[PDB]
């Protein structure tokens, strides 16, 4: 029986953008210590791996590992009721047909309750991270944003080279 409270719905909405535009369905594994989710694009050249710990939520309690997989384009439509600054809560039970999404904000007036019906997806979970990589770098995400956006204008094919 799951109950997980994001302090601001913006966060979760933003996290789903990372999957959307590149993946269709997805299993979300909920366990004592948080949520993990994995998805592979159609051509199988991109994997998206998500992990959210307990500390990222406001409240979080999950007393039983539960997979609730779902259509993301369906889920994002519910997220459009988002506000970004609203206190979003996720509820489930032992073996659930639906996840419940629960919005609230500062005035007691506006508590909306949504419900998305779940699906069966076959979980072929993938652990493909290597120990050693040839090179590691980190830079501002906004800076990276620009380089990719810019070079995408000239070619379908960007080449990274470290020497």
């Amino acid at each position: 029986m799951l109950e997980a409270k994001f302090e601001e719905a913006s966060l979760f909405k933003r996290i789903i953008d990372g999957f959307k535009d590149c993946v269709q369905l997805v299993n979300f594994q909920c366990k004592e210590d948080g949520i993990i989710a994995q998805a592979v694009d159609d051509s199988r050249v991109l994997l998206v791996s998500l992990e959210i710990g307990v500390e990222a939520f406001q409240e979080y309690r999950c007393d039983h590992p539960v997979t609730l997989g779902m259509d993301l384009t369906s889920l994002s439509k519910i997220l459009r009721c988002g506000n970004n600054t609203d206190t979003l809560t996720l509820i489930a039970d032992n073996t659930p047909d639906s996840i419940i999404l629960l919005f609230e904000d500062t005035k007691k007036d506006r508590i909306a309750e949504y419900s998305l019906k779940l699906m069966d997806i076959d979980a072929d979970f993938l652990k493909i991270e290597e120990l050693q990589y040839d090179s590691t770098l980190s830079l501002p995400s906004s800076e990276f944003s620009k380089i990719v956006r810019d070079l995408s204008q000239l070619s379908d094919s960007i080449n990274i080279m470290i020497t």
Partner: protein, 91 residues
């Protein structure tokens, strides 16, 4: 030493060069790099454009590159992360 981004397409070509450095006022705008091996890898722009979406989640992006495996792009959350593994092109 040097990180180099190159798109060489139909209409023309573009080239960005960045050097690793440490910053004083804002240490979160620094460019970190440790290089065990030279890398030379091509990726589909299509996919990098889906990947960069995660900028809205974290200040920094952590890239791991290898000729042996799919590259890893990571945006860290407060107690969590969002990863993107993308396979480079064969040719």
């Amino acid at each position: 030493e040097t990180i180099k981004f190159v798109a060489d397409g139909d209409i023309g070509s573009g080239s960005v060069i960045i050097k690793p450095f440490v910053d004083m006022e804002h240490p979160e705008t620094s460019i970190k790099l440790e290089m065990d091996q030279p890398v030379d890898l091509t990726f589909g722009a299509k996919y990098l454009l889906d990947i960069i979406k995660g900028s809205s989640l974290s200040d920094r992006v952590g890239i791991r590159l290898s000729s042996e495996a799919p590259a890893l792009f990571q945006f860290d959350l407060k107690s969590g992360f969002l990863q993107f593994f993308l396979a480079p092109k064969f040719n």
